[PDB]
Ligand binder design. Structure first.
Ligand code: HEC
Ligand SMILES: COc1cc(C=O)ccc1O
Length: 403
């Protein structure tokens, strides 16, 4: 469509999944708002355009097409107006900072210890599978009321939901190129229903302190609950991004710290710097890289593009967090970067609802990890592969330490 961007026609999904940064660097210089054929959508790549689209009164939330096929309605990420306000009201109580501070430490710290105890004396570990992901899912799972769902199962569900919700590739007719990729999303949803429908059955008659029970009961007239079909899409949104991203964020922070060994040493010596290390990790490899979207409600002009009403725009926050108009050498992890704003949690009315919770989950897990294994070192004989365009993180993180 845009003639000087004809090279975009040769960009593939695989290339974006394996490393999107080269394409998006060109996009930030050539076309901060650009239609990307394989994605079938306009894409916002700079911090200015992302921030503008995310906060504009001329835009409302929309779900990406593969996200919609995966989550259905009403996914909190893709609804507006009254439904959105109800769902925000539904999820916000356990995420309130004053509430998180009451219990986050007794929640996450014993969990981190239980997983650290399985390997802290081995001298080698794969931290993604053995620590980062389990701590992340076990923490949220217990908060939700999924105490009896195994870590390994929560991790399998978010991986399947991941691949389904990012199955974004379209052919030249605008149709999904790989419709089979939605099947494992459908299978994960089916397993989730078989496991969670009995829990909802119980919570409806016997409410408890689990978050999902509060989603059913909070703000409802006496004897009434929100219909399960009304809350399931948001349960799926949790069982993907809320389960996956704090694991991705702490693992990416570790990889960044390993890439700067004197900063890693500084953080191990002074664990009060862990929150600053995590914030730079989120900027350096944003866990939610390009999975949120908005849609114009009016005709709008963004970055010299005139958009008709009803135009979706994907927000590639992960690219915006490497904006060289904001940062010096963004592809380099640097703990001592000035604490500038970043977009790893989004912006506007649909900005992440779990920021305060997530930052504490990541802080505590890194605290316990560095105290258990202060001589942690990356295994230089293994490579670290980052994967993902919609959600991005390291596929594994092999480490060693002298025992
Ligand atoms: C306990 C729940 C929870 C956790 C954990 C969580 N999130 Fe959020 N996040 C949400 C919810 C709910 C939304 C949807 C907000 C909405 O659409 O109103 C969201 C939305 C987002 C968005 C989209 C915002 C936008 O502008 O469209 C981003 C980006 C995001 N989260 C990043 C993260 C990152 C990064 C982490 C972890 C490091 C994380 N999330 C962990 C609950 C969570
Ligand atoms: C916080 O969970 C999710 C967030 C997003 C934001 O774009 C997309 C899918 C998810 O499951």
């Amino acid at each position: 469509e845009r003639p000087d961007l004809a090279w975009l026609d040769e960009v593939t999904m695989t290339q974006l999944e394996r490393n999107p940064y080269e394409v998006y660097e060109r996009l930030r210089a050539e076309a901060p708002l650009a239609f990307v054929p394989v994605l079938g959508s306009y894409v916002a790549s700079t911090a200015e355009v992302c921030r503008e689209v995310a906060t504009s009164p001329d835009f409302e939330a929309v779900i990406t097409p593969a996200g919609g096929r995966t989550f259905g309605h009403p996914a909190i990420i893709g609804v507006n107006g009254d439904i959105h306000a109800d769902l925000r009201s539904m999820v916000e109580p356990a995420l309130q900072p004053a509430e998180v501070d009451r219990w986050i430490d007794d929640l996450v710290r014993p969990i981190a210890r239980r997983y650290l105890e399985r390997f802290e004396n081995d001298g080698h570990a794969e931290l993604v599978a053995q620590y980062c992901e389990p701590v992340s899912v076990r923490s949220l799972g217990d908060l939700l009321g999924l105490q009896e769902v195994d870590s390994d199962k929560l991790r399998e569900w978010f991986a399947k939901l991941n691949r389904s919700a990012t199955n974004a590739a379209v052919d030249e007719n605008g149709e999904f190129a790989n419709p089979e990729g939605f099947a494992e999303g459908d299978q994960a949803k089916a397993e989730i229903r078989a496991v969670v429908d009995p829990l909802i059955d119980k919570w409806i008659e016997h409410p408890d302190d689990s978050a999902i029970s509060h989603w059913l009961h909070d703000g409802m007239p006496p004897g009434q609950t929100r219909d399960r079909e009304y809350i399931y899409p948001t349960i799926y949104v949790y069982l993907l991004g809320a389960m996956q991203e704090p694991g991705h964020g702490m693992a990416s922070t570790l990889v960044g710290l390993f890439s700067r060994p004197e900063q890693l040493e500084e953080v191990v010596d002074d664990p009060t710097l862990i929150p600053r290390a995590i914030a730079e990790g989120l900027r350096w490899t944003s866990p939610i890289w390009s999975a949120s979207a908005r849609i114009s409600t009016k005709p709008v002009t963004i970055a010299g593009v005139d958009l008709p009403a009803g135009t979706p725009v994907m927000l590639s926050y992960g690219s915006a967090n490497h904006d060289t108009g904001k940062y010096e050498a963004p592809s380099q992890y640097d703990l001592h970067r000035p604490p500038l704003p970043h977009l790893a949690f989004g912006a506007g009315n649909h900005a992440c609802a779990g920021i305060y919770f997530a930052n504490h989950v990541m802080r505590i897990a890194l605290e316990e990890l560095f105290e258990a294994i202060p001589n942690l070192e990356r295994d230089t004989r293994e490579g670290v592969e980052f994967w993902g365009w919609g959600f991005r993180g390291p596929t594994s993180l092999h480490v060693t330490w002298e025992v």
